[PDB]
Design a protein around this ligand. Structure first.
Ligand SMILES: O=C(O)CCC(=O)C(=O)O
Ligand SMILES: [Cl-]
Length: 497
């Protein structure tokens, strides 16, 4: 005698439900493309100091006299000769491969080498803030108006970032884009789960994952189609405009209406669902009286000792997983092969890794799967960072294996943290873990910023942190017995056993 009873009465596989899920999961390809866009919209082409116009190249016999060479047989990327001196007349970029990126229009090079990483860090700060505050805003307003606001904000911010007079405007609009995009990312699954019955909830989760993979495909497709960054960003952001346009056709989740103390809206929504589903005859029996008889915290997380330890461990796990995943995904320039091919192979490797990880976690365990994922990924990143730049195919195979390992790690940590926490604070634990993953994704570009000290130290850290987290995760209890802890006391009793 719960909400699921009425949900099954009205259907569960009906036309409205399938249409709504296949409609709401649709912008997740644009989610993936927007998250990974910095690879194609901020690629660094080879460049050198432009010789001053005072000297003539006709009498100089070439451009070698006005440009010092580096050890790799290329003109120096930050110096120019006096007859040395830093760039004073700008930079010269080629157009053989990348017609234009941000580092060629606003010359984010030399002294301003860290500005692209700072912009990505600001986008991740926007992601964190648009999760933190928009979760409360959605809980206080709803799950449809918030979604349409997310659509509008992400589309407007994408277009405005595409047409940016300078770099500060770009960073601010990336902040706003992260806000809206994180909010839609965390509200899509919530609304879809809250409308689906029990089994189609897991079906919807798998659908969301597969759509993410298809989006990783679509990013490479668009990048091959559109090379210009000012046009690539516009092409990625345009379908979000029609998304906001047609997002008014969604139906709000009835569970949120019930939780708000009102049931007439719930009855109206269910009757509308039956009308779309065609089961008006069965939905007519629904009424306020029937619904009335059928519809019947972070402080303590850091207060309780065992809860505090468990939160610390889960925080480290989420932090390292997001760290490694974003750091490895957002670097497809120094891997030899072209960006589009490596990106499409990255998208292809996602699904088999997820299938293998699901088989492993349902076969032998979850914590050993997290071991064989995180430690393997860390070792892969270390050996990638130590392998000389000359090797290309080995580096690319290592990178795709690492991306598959990170996807498997993400799935395993989600499915493990879902059944770890007691039911009292499980949702808050999931939210805290997601926040820790987002702050790890915040810090990862900041770590990559430190490539000035050493060209390979960002990869070294990106590998090392997962290794430490894998060592840390060995102290977590195994949850193959499916005890499903209820409260803190139940957690304590099963901990000893
Ligand atoms: O592929 C990703 O971006 C995340 C992993 C995934 O498929 C999911 O979280 O559903
Ligand atoms: Cl998120």
């Amino acid at each position: 005698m719960a909400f699921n009873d009425l949900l099954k009465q009205v259907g569960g596989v009906g036309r409205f439900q399938l249409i709504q899920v296949t409609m709401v999961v649709a912008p997740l390809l644009l989610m993936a493309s927007h998250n990974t866009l910095q690879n194609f919209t901020a690629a660094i082409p080879p460049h050198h100091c432009r010789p001053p116009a005072n000297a003539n190249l006709s009498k100089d016999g070439g451009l070698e006299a006005w440009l010092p060479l580096d050890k790799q047989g290329q003109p120096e990327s930050c110096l120019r000769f006096t007859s040395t001196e830093p760039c004073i007349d700008g930079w010269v970029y080629d157009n053989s491969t990348f017609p234009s990126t941000i580092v060629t229009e606003w010359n984010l090079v030399c002294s301003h080498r860290a500005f692209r990483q700072l912009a990505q860090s600001l986008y991740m700060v926007g992601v964190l803030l648009g999760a933190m505050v928009f979760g409360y805003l959605a809980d206080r307003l709803g799950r449809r108006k918030v979604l349409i606001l997310n659509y509008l904000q992400t589309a407007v911010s994408g277009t405005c970032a595409a047409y940016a007079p300078n770099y500060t405007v770009y960073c601010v609009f990336r902040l706003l884009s992260g806000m809206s995009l994180a909010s839609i990312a965390i509200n899509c699954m919530t609304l879809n789960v809250e409308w689906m019955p029990i089994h189609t909830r897991a079906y919807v989760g798998t659908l969301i994952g597969y759509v993410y993979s298809l989006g990783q495909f679509l990013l490479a497709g668009i990048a091959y189609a559109v090379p210009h960054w000012r046009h690539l960003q516009l092409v990625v952001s345009v379908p979000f405009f029609i998304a906001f346009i047609y997002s008014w056709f969604f139906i709000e989740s009835a569970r949120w209406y019930s939780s708000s103390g009102r049931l007439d809206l719930t009855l109206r929504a269910l009757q509308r669902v039956a009308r779309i589903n065609g089961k008006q005859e069965e939905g007519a029996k629904l009424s306020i009286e029937v619904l009335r008889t059928s519809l019947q915290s972070a402080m303590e997380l850091l207060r309780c000792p065992t809860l505090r330890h468990l939160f610390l461990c889960l925080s480290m796990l989420w932090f390292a997983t997001s760290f490694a995943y974003y750091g490895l995904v957002m670097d497809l320039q120094g891997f030899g092969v072209s960006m589009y091919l490596i990106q499409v192979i990255f998208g292809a490797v996602d699904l088999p890794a997820k299938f293998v990880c699901f088989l492993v976690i349902n076969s032998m365990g979850r914590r050993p799967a997290q071991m064989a994922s995180l430690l393997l990924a860390g070792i892969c990143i270390l050996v990638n960072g130590i392998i000389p730049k000359s090797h290309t195919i080995i580096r690319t195979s290592l990178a795709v294996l690492g991306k598959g390992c990170l996807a498997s790690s993400f799935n395993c940590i989600f499915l493990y943290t879902g059944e770890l926490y007691p039911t009292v604070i499980r949702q808050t634990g999931l939210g805290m873990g997601s926040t820790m993953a987002r702050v790890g994704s915040i810090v990862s570009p900041l770590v990559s910023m430190t490539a000035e000290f050493y060209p390979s130290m960002p990869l070294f850290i990106f590998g090392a942190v997962p290794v430490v987290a894998s060592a840390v995760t060995a102290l977590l209890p195994e949850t193959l017995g499916q005890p499903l802890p209820d409260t803190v006391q139940d957690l304590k009793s099963r901990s000893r056993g």
